[PDB]
Amino acid sequence: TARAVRGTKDLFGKELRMHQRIVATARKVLEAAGALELVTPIFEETQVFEKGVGAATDIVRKEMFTFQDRGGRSLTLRPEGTAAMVRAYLEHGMKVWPQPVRLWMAGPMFRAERPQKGRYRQFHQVNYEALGSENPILDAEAVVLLYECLKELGLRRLKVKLSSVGDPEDRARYNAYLREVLSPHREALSEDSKERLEENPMRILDSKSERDQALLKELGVRPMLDFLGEEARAHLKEVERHLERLSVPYELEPALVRGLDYYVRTAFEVHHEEIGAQSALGGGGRYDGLSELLGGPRVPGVGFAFGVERVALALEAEGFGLPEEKGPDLYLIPLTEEAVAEAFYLAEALRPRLRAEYALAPRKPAKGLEEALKRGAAFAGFLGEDELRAGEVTLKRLATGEQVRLSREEVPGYLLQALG
Amino acid sequence: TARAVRGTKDLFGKELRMHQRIVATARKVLEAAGALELVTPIFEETQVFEKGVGAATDIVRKEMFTFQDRGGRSLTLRPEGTAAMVRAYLEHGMKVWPQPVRLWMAGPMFRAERPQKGRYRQFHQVNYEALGSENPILDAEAVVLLYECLKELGLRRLKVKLSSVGDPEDRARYNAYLREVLSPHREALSEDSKERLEENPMRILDSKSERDQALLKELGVRPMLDFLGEEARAHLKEVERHLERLSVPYELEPALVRGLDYYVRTAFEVHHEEIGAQSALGGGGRYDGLSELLGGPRVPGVGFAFGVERVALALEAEGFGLPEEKGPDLYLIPLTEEAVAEAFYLAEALRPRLRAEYALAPRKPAKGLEEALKRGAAFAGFLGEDELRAGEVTLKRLATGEQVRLSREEVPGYLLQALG
Ligand SMILES: N[C@@H](Cc1c[nH]c[nH+]1)C(=O)O
Ligand SMILES: N[C@@H](Cc1c[nH]c[nH+]1)C(=O)O
């Protein structure tokens, strides 16, 4: 009856392997930059995400799998990694390690989204974090690291986008501006936008429908860029200076509305055309003050995260494939009932240095050979009356059909030299 | 304010590395036996565990983190892997793949346990599964694989325990027997046991408290083993035949009650008496009929699972340590403020082929050298006014004190040949 809940799926085969390659590469680039692997629990106290992600965001308000612990306490399935990372930083007194502290991890993230496929309720992302410093070098580094993780995978058609949200103060003033300009024209907004006009009006910029877009155009709504505090623009220029020097091709966006509310200053995203909507492979930005929201001291930080599934799609789009699932080095086929157990014993003597499998029931040579082929085995191994009594095994390389009869002892060596 | 919820913890450093070594080894032994890696979602429809694990078990009744889908459906955080594996087997029509289908995975498991340390609410286990066959060779194989996963890690002091729970008929009769012997003495049972006496009385055997143990002793309660039917007895003997042949030292237990209700016939566990209570490193058994409980056809199966944390403790107990975390190949120390950014740029030119790190602020040579040493760096790199204007870098192997001044171009090669 039961199936895997919509939005989640079993990972195996080529799909699983691609994910592993992706995380493997991310591990290499991130750790070369000094990042330490830190894996946080699957769930945190619901407050870590409420306060952290901001009580006004879609995620917190209606997209988190939150439940209650038997007796008391509210727990929530991690929807994103940054807040948890900061929570960990705080808890482990990382403030005392030599700064900045770079952390990275790869794991599942959960988001309660309205059922109708949509996309994913359980997805996986690589998360990088640089904590303990306001230096714009880290922002540039974070952007380069994300860019390189994808670049190393073989992706070529990426679109880096950079911008800034100024600071909570600048963010506030821009919102006020939006209300003042939009409210008297409130009646020309999409129902969706009319709600967004209440909390975090900026979203109305990144909304769909023609109603909104045409209005914004005629009203001459000015870009979030025009509201950056000077220190903010100084910082952003430093980041651009570094990226240009590192030759990272980017485009400065008029405004980058990120789905989380802890962002301050730098904000970036890397896209890929070949995905359709949800072209974002990953993104990130600075988030000083988040630690304070979780009740800690001031701890500056920048980082990014990217969706493994998204990256996989991008790879597929660029024609990157994976080679066929390897079969067993040897597949033992018993010719008599007594032989089935002997095949098992022989297989055990060969493992784990050699991948040896066997049939659990006797069968004709041709049939068992058919099954060995069916399993992609390199060698077929026959165990009938003769070899059982002689303490030998009849091996047959399936590719050429070449056959060899040798003692059980030589088998490991013969196979290893013939395949290694 | 927030901490990692009791029963969960952040994995990093040596602790994380041990887990990876453990899973790495398990991967090798399991995949050599033909196991395919299959990772199931973090949560399943609550029914998969209710019906699967059995509605009478402690796990289902009061130890599962269950919550409601943002729109109805009851979802539950996976407390164990077998049911999910069978669910996957059913869903993907693996029944049409060549049998038996061997699957393995390593991941987090969640159990809502009463807060007071109590060990773990989120732990990790390696799970092996062999589906599609009643053959006792698979049971022996499952036992040998679990044994070998631990054996390969270096563990020597393991205690393998084997037993059987018979067939549904034998299981029923033993339960009846338990009721008949225990009911008239019902008043001497622990409150917990008095409930278990209603559905699946066998649990009362594997319960805690002295109140139960002493009673069972004086009453002369007979082992589940004496109640095995003929076919069950035959199957178990086959398993012992195989284990003895493979020289796997085991002890036949009178009654090895396991923690789940889907078990039928073979049941085994490997313990280590140097962890205190909870000496079970892992265990498993056969579970035909589970697929049917999930609404599928009859699919026989055996498997095991072991706690990575438990195994880690066992390793520690046997004195197995982890060495030194590698430091960066190069640690660039800026001598002027202008140099910090240059160090970053240089570091970026060297990565990811080389692990290069740098200080984010200028410092005196001696100080930066001490920091390079603290970080376990192979080479220290100086960037002061001289080298900045000359387009060079002053390298110093911290080991031999050998100092070299070379051009930025000569750096990647020199470092690679000096460390590769
Ligand atoms: N966690 C953010 C990305 C991020 C990581 N660090 C900073 N921002 C996301 O879910 O997109
Ligand atoms: N599911 C079992 C392990 C197992 C695998 N196969 C049969 N049993 C456990 O949680 O201990």
Ligand 2 probe mutation, B38, B82, B311, most atoms within 8 A of CB: B82
HSE at residue A328, side-chain half, CA atoms within 13 A, is 29
What would you report as the CA-atom Rg of chain A, rounded to the nearest whole angstrom? Answer: 29
- Classify the phi-psi angles of A357: left when phi > 0, otherwise alpha if psi is within -120 to 50, otherwise beta: beta
* B266-271 and B280-286 beta bridge pairing: antiparallel
Ligand 1 pocket, A283 CB below 6 A?
Answer: yes
Q: Identify the CA nearest to B312 among candidates B325, B322, B323.
A: B322
Fold of B1-322: BirA Bifunctional Protein; domain 2 (3.30.930)
- Determine contact, residues B306/B105, Cβ cutoff 8 Å: no
Ligand 2 pocket, B82 CB below 6 A?
Answer: yes
Four-CA torsion A285, A288, A289, A291, nearest 10 degrees? 90
Q: Identify the CA nearest to B174 among candidates B182, B7, A252, B330.
A: B182
Distance CA B362, CA B338 (A): 9
Give the residue range(s) of CATH 3.30.930.10 domains in chain B: 1-322
Give the Cβ contact number of residue A205 at 10 Å: 19
Q: Report the run of H or E that residue B266 belongs to, with start and end.
A: strand B266-271
Four-CA torsion B48, B53, B56, B59, nearest 10 degrees? -100
Distance CA A34, CA A37 (A): 10
Distance CA A13, CA B112 (A): 32
CATH code assigned to A325-418:
3.40.50.800
Distance CA A148, CA B215 (A): 67
Q: How was this entry determined?
A: X-ray
Q: Report the run of H or E that residue A27 belongs to, with start and end.
A: helix A13-32
Distance CA A35, CA A37 (A): 7
Residue A66 is encoded by which pair of tokens?
């939150």
Three-state SS for A228? coil
DSSP-assigned states of every residue in B353-400 = TS-EEE-SS---HHHHHHHHHHTT-SEEEEE-HHHHHHTEEEEEETTT
Q: Identify the CA nearest to A284 among candidates A170, A109, A142, A141.
A: A142
Distance CA A190, CA A208 (A): 9
Centroid of chain to Cα A84: 16
Name the H helices within A153-229. Answer: 168-182, 191-196, 210-219
Of B12, B67, B138, the CB nearest to A65: B67
DSSP state of B126: E
**Resolution, expressed in angstroms to one decimal:** 2.7
Residue A361 is encoded by which pair of tokens?
């029931």
Distance CA A262, CA A372 (A): 57
Q: Do A38 and B11 touch (CB under 8 A)?
A: yes
**A117 touches B: beta carbon within 8 Å:** no
Centroid of chain to Cα B226: 33
Distance CA B27, CA B24 (A): 5
What would you report as the CA-atom Rg of chain B, rounded to the nearest whole angstrom? Answer: 28
- Determine contact, residues B167/B229, Cβ cutoff 8 Å: yes
- CA of A316 from ligand 1 middle (Å) equals 24
Chain A closest-CA separation from residue B248 CA (Å): 12
- The dihedral built from the CA positions of residue A255, A261, A266 and A268, taken in this order, carries a sign that is negative
Give residues with Cβ within 8 angstroms of B81, minimum separation 6: B40, B105, B107, B109, B125, B127, B129, B305
Fold of A1-324: BirA Bifunctional Protein; domain 2 (3.30.930)
- The dihedral built from the CA positions of residue A57, B66, A85 and B348, taken in this order, carries a sign that is negative
CA distances from B153 to B28, B371, B377 (A): 11, 35, 30
Phi and psi of B44, rounded to 5°? -130, 170
- Determine contact, residues A298/A287, Cβ cutoff 8 Å: no
Give the Cβ contact number of residue A178 at 10 Å: 23
**A32 touches B: beta carbon within 8 Å:** yes
Residue A215 is encoded by which pair of tokens?
């209005």
DSSP state of B296: -
- Classify the phi-psi angles of B143: left when phi > 0, otherwise alpha if psi is within -120 to 50, otherwise beta: alpha
Chain B closest-CA separation from residue A40 CA (Å): 5
Give the residue range(s) of CATH 3.40.50.800 domains in chain B: 323-418
Which residues is A251 bridged to in the sheet?
A161
Distance CA A135, CA A138 (A): 6
Q: Do B42 and A8 touch (CB under 8 A)?
A: yes
- Determine contact, residues A113/A144, Cβ cutoff 8 Å: no
| Strand residue runs (E) in B3-141 | 11-12, 36-39, 43-45, 66-68, 74-77, 101-110, 122-131
Ligand 1 pocket, A79 CB below 6 A?
Answer: no
Distance CA A159, CA A249 (A): 8
Phi and psi of A92, rounded to 5°? -85, 10
Q: What is Dmax (Cα atoms) for chain B? A: 95
Which of 280-309 (A) contact B at CB < 8 A? 294-296
**A16 touches B: beta carbon within 8 Å:** yes
Q: Which residue minimizes the CA distance to atom 8 of ligand 2?
A: B284
Q: Report the run of H or E that residue B330 belongs to, with start and end.
A: strand B330-334
Amino acid at A409: E
Q: List the helix and strand counts (H, then E) for chain B.
A: 15, 17
Q: Identify the CA nearest to A217 among candidates A188, A175, A246.
A: A188
**A190 touches B: beta carbon within 8 Å:** no
Centroid of chain to Cα B138: 21
- CA of A16 from ligand 1 middle (Å) equals 23
Residue A189 is encoded by which pair of tokens?
């907004």
Ligand 2 pocket, B284 CB below 6 A?
Answer: yes
Q: Can you identify the CATH homologous superfamily of domain B323-418?
A: Anticodon-binding domain (3.40.50.800)
Which of 65-84 (B) contact A at CB < 8 A? 65-71, 73, 75, 77
Residue B283 is encoded by which pair of tokens?
């265990």
- CA of A81 from ligand 2 middle (Å) equals 30
Q: Identify the CA nearest to A65 among candidates B387, B44, B70.
A: B70
Give the residue range(s) of CATH 3.30.930.10 domains in chain A: 1-324
**B385 touches A: beta carbon within 8 Å:** no
Ligand nearest to the CA of B78: 2
